[PDB]
Amino acid sequence: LALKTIDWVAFAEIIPQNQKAIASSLKSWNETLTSRLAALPENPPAIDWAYYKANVAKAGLVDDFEKKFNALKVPVPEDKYTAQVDAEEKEDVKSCAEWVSLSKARIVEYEKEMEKMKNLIPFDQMTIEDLNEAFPETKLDKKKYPYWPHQPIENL
Template structure:
């Protein structure tokens, strides 16, 4: 019972009323009163016994066969409950999704660490004005031309030239 009442008091009405204008306060108070009445009626209905007192109806109704017929039909009627055939699939999918998210986060953390290492390396370089061409080739080996394999300018494979020119255009 206390848990039901605790769930009802989720809205802090005093803070809500403090933060609203004077024109809207009566509407909010009316809404609060209506919701409180609905919640109270709901809690009261849940506390009442939902079973049928058949002895009372047998004493009040003159046609005993009618009461017996209603009682027999009421007790024989079973409300069909839906079969839960999706929860297992959804739980498996949730586990797979959690594994995929974990894997993605690990890959992302690895990329972030790689970027941080690269950033730290770039920040540790001397100023651009102080770099020589040999320093650039030392810190960026992918830029070093291969004079042995390609002795003529641009010292790269012809298939790599489109990538090379796209970088500088």
């Protein structure tokens, strides 16, 4: 019974909006099972036979009642459910690490671009083609507007 202590807000941030109900039900059952392990002790008090040896005046029935108990094989339930959530955790960690490598690719591209923008030519020594290759939003659509001024007259 060595449990994994959990943050609950952290648990909240990682739940997609198609299974919020399941997250809350898992949480409520966590709390319910904590409560129910609280309100029942660990091992039953095995009553001494003494109060049932020296005050049960019946012919050996108490003794077989106690032998059938000392020899009982009470069924310990096995997991049959934890191994598959371990497999699901492995599959999820696979997906997570691959998505992280993708985001690191995007981040190195963004850092390259911010180094590009940080080392721009001063704007007073900049041709117009340098601007059209720095901020390509500033390029005249010589495709749609083929004739001068290459833009709508109202834009001017």
